[PDB]
């Protein structure tokens, strides 16, 4: 059979492992099929994958990803003869209609960077009481984040909550949701993400949109304007300024070259 | 204090035992262990083991033999041989193996897919142990001692129960490592459980060529089974006993290659 050779760049945006495929039809029909192949452990590993063209980033499912957009912005600095310490890069991403002005700065090594990006605004902020648990609820365009504060609630297993949430959205149509298990003693967060297609949960290494939900929620409930939220395999800082949300974090270009898959 | 190191990498999938081979590097660098450690992280290029190439030699990150890695190296040689058609034998060497390794590489469906057969080290001991209520066929080797367990031929048990029982065996025996081949005769399946004193914990590998070898030896005595294809958690390897010599066959796919950037 035919082996298809693609141009790849592997990047670690604060643990949210991203692969970017270059010189590829960003609107190819088979993108979702080869994307899951690119991500398996039996191939190059990845938590997400995108297909770049000029200054656009076409995610595998037309979704917007703050972490992926920051990886793409750090890649343009990596490849820019003129980049010194700081430089703003304008890009576009599927799922966001506005041009994104990403502030990229050097973070030590030439492959290491720090990328800040403007994050979408929330559509609603509710504080909900489900059964005998308090939860935070932040509704975005596409995904609904839930904030479960470990300390502020009684002892329980995560699994009980993932099920309880799933019960809350029983009579509510959604494409995906997220539970941000938040530990106040540490200012840490374990991001959870269910989606309809996968039909199963996924504990991520870091979740940019989830950190904004966390951020919006700590702003309204505790008057916290910006903070650094440590996550399973990385960290992200949320910044609220002039009523605008921004997520900053580290980024690192891992590897670059060719990837051989079937056709 | 900021410096990027640029290495040539090849990512291969020898029956689920993800391998990264580094090319054109000093295979006797002091920093090899630390470089292998960072390259293996999930937050980096992912890998279960790292090798370092020099001509026809493969230098594993610690100086130890790996049948899967060697199979991956040979498959790479075939990948880069413009004259490889459908089958070709390749002569290579591997750290921790005093004898040259003639590897039989064959096409497996495409230019990146290969079937590679390799000769494996012979066992140093073969014996049937009987702990508490269960029996288990120890097949020792220079490095690791594998503990076969036939589940169809044993009473109802828990995997963890056995693991503990075996770990208590090894108390009075100095062991740098040990493994447990959970073998199911009905489906010819095998769950390779491994343990290391340094790690202090176990892992169920996607494949173990040396464990399939141990299984094969015990099956040749306990059944007179000379060869069989053993399905594993994320891959399959076939064992072939021939002229009292152990071979391991299996698939190897070339995943990717290019450059990797590591700070120093």
Residue numbers in the entry:
A (entry chain A): 3 to 265
B (entry chain C): 2 to 265
What are the paper's exact sentences on this?
To confirm this, we used site-directed mutagenesis to generate HisR mutants C67S and C209S. Catalytic turnover of these mutants was greatly reduced with D- and L-histidine compared to the WT enzyme, as expected. Mutation of an active site cysteine to serine is a common strategy to aid crystallization of cofactor-independent epimerases and racemases, and likely aids the process because this mutation slows catalysis and helps to keep the enzyme in the open conformation. In the asymmetric unit of C67S, there are two back-to-back dimers, while the asymmetric unit of C209S has one dimer and two monomers. Structures of C67S and C209S HisR were very similar, with a backbone r.m.s.d. of 0.493 Å by aligning α-carbons of 260 residues, and each adopt a DapF-like fold. In each structure, a sulfate (mutant C67S) or a phosphate (mutant C209S) is found in the active site directly between catalytic residues. The substrate binding pocket of HisR has an overall negatively charged surface, and does not contain any basic residues. The position of the loops above the active site spanning from residues 42 to 49 (N-terminal domain) and 197 to 206 (C-terminal domain) in HisR more closely match the conformation of the open C. glutamicum structure than the substrate-bound, closed form. The positions of backbone atoms in DAP and 4-hydroxyproline substrates were highly conserved, and interactions with their respective epimerase enzymes were very similar.
Here, we characterize this enzyme as a histidine racemase (HisR), and found that catalytic turnover is ∼10,000× faster with L-histidine than with L,L-lanthionine. The rate of HisR was not affected by buffer composition (PO4 or Tris), ions (SO42−, Mg2+, and EDTA), or the PLP inhibitor hydroxylamine; however, the enzyme activity was hindered by iodoacetamide and Hg2+, which are known inhibitors of enzymes with catalytic thiols. These results, along with a sequence alignment of HisR with other cofactor-independent racemase and epimerase enzymes, suggested that HisR operates via a two-base mechanism using cysteine residues 67 and 209. The DapF-like fold is an overall α+β structure, in which the monomer unit is composed of two structurally equivalent N-terminal and C-terminal domains.
